[PDB]
Amino acid sequence: MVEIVYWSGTGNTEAMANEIEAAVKAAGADVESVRFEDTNVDDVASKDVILLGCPAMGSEELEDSVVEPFFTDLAPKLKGKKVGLFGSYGWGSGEWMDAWKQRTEDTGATVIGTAIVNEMPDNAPECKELGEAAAKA
Numbered sequence: 284m285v286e287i288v289y290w291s292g293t294g295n296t297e298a299m300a301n302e303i304e305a306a307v308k309a310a311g312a313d314v315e316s317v318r319f320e321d322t323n324v325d326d327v328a329s330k331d332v333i334l335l336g337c338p339a340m341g342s343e344e345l346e347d348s349v350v351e352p353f354f355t356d357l358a359p360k361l362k363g364k365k366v367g368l369f370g371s372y373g374w375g376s377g378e379w380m381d382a383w384k385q386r387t388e389d390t391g392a393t394v395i396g397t398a399i400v401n402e403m404p405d406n407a408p409e410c411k412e413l414g415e416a417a418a419k420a
């Protein structure tokens with residue numbers, strides 16, 4: 284059981300989440316895909332595996348006004364659980380995802396892969412890989 288929580292500006296992370304979802308469904312696993320704006324730590328608690336979807340913003344950062352408020356709320360129950368990280372970038376890779384990995388790992392949770400894409404999904408099999416991994420917790 285996987286809660287795929289995504290923040291999508293320009294369709295990108297939605298389509299990424301959809302790709303992941305298909306790989307989860309292929310291995311007969313229950314998926315709950317929602318947006319960062321409409322979720323809660325209590326919901327997350329019921330799912331052994333969680334995936335977070337945030338594109339690269341400003342100067343190689345996470346999306347401050349939604350993802351960081353939800354992350355702080357999430358932190359008390361982000362222990363032991365399998366958390367996969369998925370994001371789209373334009374011109375700069377890695378940094379935002381490294382900082383993101385560091386904070387998600389740091390709460391006592393483990394990272395069930397990191398998917399980085401050049402704007403649009405499919406261009407990185409990583410998305411599908413994360414799907415498979417999430418299906419298998």
Ligand SMILES: Cc1cc2c(cc1C)N(C[C@H](O)[C@H](O)[C@H](O)COP(=O)(O)O)c1[nH]c(=O)[nH]c(=O)c1N2
Nearest residue numbers: 292293338339340341342343371372373374375402
């Ligand atoms: C205000 C703003 C700021 C950034 C971006 C876009 C926008 C609109 N993008 C590109 C972005 O990661 C890419 O286009 C995503 O596929 C879509 O991101 P959003 O859904 O538009 O936030 C971007 N890309 C990148 O590689 N490093 C960066 O720091 C940023 N910063």
